[PDB]
Amino acid sequence: VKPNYALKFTLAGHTKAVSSVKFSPNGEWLASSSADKLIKIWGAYDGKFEKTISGHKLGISDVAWSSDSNLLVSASDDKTLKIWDVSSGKCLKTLKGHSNYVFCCNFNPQSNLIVSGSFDESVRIWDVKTGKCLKTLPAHSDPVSAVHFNRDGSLIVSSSYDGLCRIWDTASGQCLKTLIDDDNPPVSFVKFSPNGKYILAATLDNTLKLWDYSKGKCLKTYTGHKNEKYCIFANFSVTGGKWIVSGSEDNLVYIWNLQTKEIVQKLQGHTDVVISTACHPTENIIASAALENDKTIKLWKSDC
């Protein structure tokens, strides 16, 4: 079986390249971050603009929701992360500690911690309540492209332009594993699978790979798209058919069958690199965002 995603809405608003889009865990909203220093909230089902959240001094590279859909955390070129209360729009805390651009961020499952990756080549773990840095991990030898907590939050996976994917013990900060294949291209994105058994990793050699974390080996590879310059997000679509979703440097959204690795659909419409995609938690809905020459977000819907 194959999906039939069709364009339903195009969201205009950001004045510069959009950097990331994420659906709230409760499925009510879509948050977007942009090089325009802003975060915008949109209705997940109707694509209707809700509000703008401002505060950062420079462009934003990533934004993420807390487990209860009440908070957001953003990573910016101003070298800070900001925790926001979505309902009030207030900046609850500004996390200062990184010495260079903050590139990626995420809350842990209980949302009491935030993990961040920066151009300073480190990974930091922060306490949400106090906004204080708990640990600084000398994780890589190049910018950290992504950071993500596993299902129970005991592990953190990080990726970097240095070509490595490393898994860290949240409590001790010890490097528990370094994953790399036969080549050393920059690793542009990583994240644990929904069940926490795998790690989906993107490398700047036009490849996505599904790794078995425990065994430390590559199980599947997804190819066919273009990705050699930007850190494009990738997702696990689990509402209908089990797919792998990702933007591409040819302005398209690619969708692969996770098990067979075959391309099942390509979404056309954006006018620039699709830097970020996200899959709704309960409906077969995909949100995609593009760079500078496009500046829009698109919502696609499928029956399966």
């Binding site: 510069k16 950097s19 942009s34 590279s61 651009y101 830097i275």
Partner: peptide, 9 residues
Amino acid sequence: GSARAEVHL
């Protein structure tokens, strides 16, 4: 405008 929207060598 932001690191992610730029190319890194």
